């Protein structure tokens, strides 16, 4: 529903942490959703996600990243837009991705990855940004 030639996942890219995926995600491939039974609210939809992390490993179009909560893995990076190049160990980047696996280690199919290393504040805010947002979804 747009230009032909643009088709996006159904619900938006929810900001998350590796740990949340690892623990609160439910269903299985193509049918993913995050549990918020802890704060007694309903399940949120996990088609796409927005994660951030430092690159640990980079192998072609695979990569392992890490956020404060833990390690997550990405594939298919050879197919997304290439901005400033950032598939280097030690860069801090963001992924938009479609959830493949959640546990024991979360795997995404990348739609985008973008450098965020030219400004430290991105890293400082990531964990609060995640939390603030989960707080503002009813």
């Amino acid at each position: 529903g747009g230009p032909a030639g643009v088709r996006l996942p159904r619900s938006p890219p929810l900001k998350v942490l590796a740990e949340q995926l690892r623990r609160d995600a439910e269903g299985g491939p193509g049918a993913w959703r995050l549990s918020r039974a802890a704060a007694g609210r309903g399940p949120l939809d996990l088609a796409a996600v927005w994660m951030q992390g430092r690159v640990v490993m980079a192998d072609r179009g695979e990569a392992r990243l890490r956020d404060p909560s833990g390690d997550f893995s990405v594939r298919g990076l050879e197919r997304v837009p290439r901005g400033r190049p950032c598939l280097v160990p030690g860069k801090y980047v963001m992924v938009m991705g479609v959830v493949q696996a959640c546990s024991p280690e979360p795997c995404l199919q990348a739609v985008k990855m973008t450098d965020l290393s030219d400004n430290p504040i991105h890293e400082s805010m990531w964990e609060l940004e995640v939390e603030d947002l989960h707080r503002n979804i009813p």
């Binding site: 747009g2 230009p3 643009v6 996006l8 938006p12 890219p13 929810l14 900001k15 927005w50 837009p81 290439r82 901005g83 400033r84 963001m94 938009m96 739609v111 985008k112 973008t114 450098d115 965020l116 400004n119 504040i121 991105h122 400082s124 805010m125 609060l128 940004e129 939390e131 603030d132 947002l133 707080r135 503002n136 979804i137 009813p138």
Partner: protein, 143 residues
């Protein structure tokens, strides 16, 4: 809910649930999911449509002229006059490369002007996050 002026930024899904009657300015941290359009110079000004997200919603936007001019380094008039000289047109093309990259990599605080009857907003200005932003987010989570 959250007032729509709460620093350091608000959420598009909160704005929507507000059900605004009038055109409404908010500020959000978004990135471009995709373009929906080629760079245009129709009207004698730059335009480009995109879908952004702030993690809560997707939203169609158009960039204002002033943004796209500052990304390219050339206004529409300057671009036309650049076509008359090879050396200056080359600088325009690098301007264009740079802009297309900027858009790929854009992830910041957008000041968006949202028209509720049209499901369509206009991005008025962009800004990078700073220490102040961080504090505000700290304070708002009481942390």
């Amino acid at each position: 809910a959250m007032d729509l002026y709460s620093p350091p930024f608000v959420y598009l899904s909160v704005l929507m649930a507000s059900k605004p009657k009038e055109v409404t300015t908010v500020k959000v941290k978004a990135f471009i999911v995709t373009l929906t359009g080629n760079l245009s110079s129709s009207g004698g000004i730059w335009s480009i449509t995109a879908k952004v997200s702030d993690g809560t919603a997707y939203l169609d936007v158009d960039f204002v002229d002033e943004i796209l001019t500052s990304l390219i380094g050339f206004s529409v008039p300057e671009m036309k006059q650049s076509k008359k000289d090879p050396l200056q047109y080359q600088k325009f093309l690098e301007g264009l490369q740079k802009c297309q990259r900027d858009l790929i990599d854009l992830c910041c605080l957008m000041t968006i002007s949202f028209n509720p009857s049209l499901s369509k907003a206009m991005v008025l200005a962009l800004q990078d996050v700073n220490m102040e932003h961080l504090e505000n987010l700290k304070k708002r989570l009481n942390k």
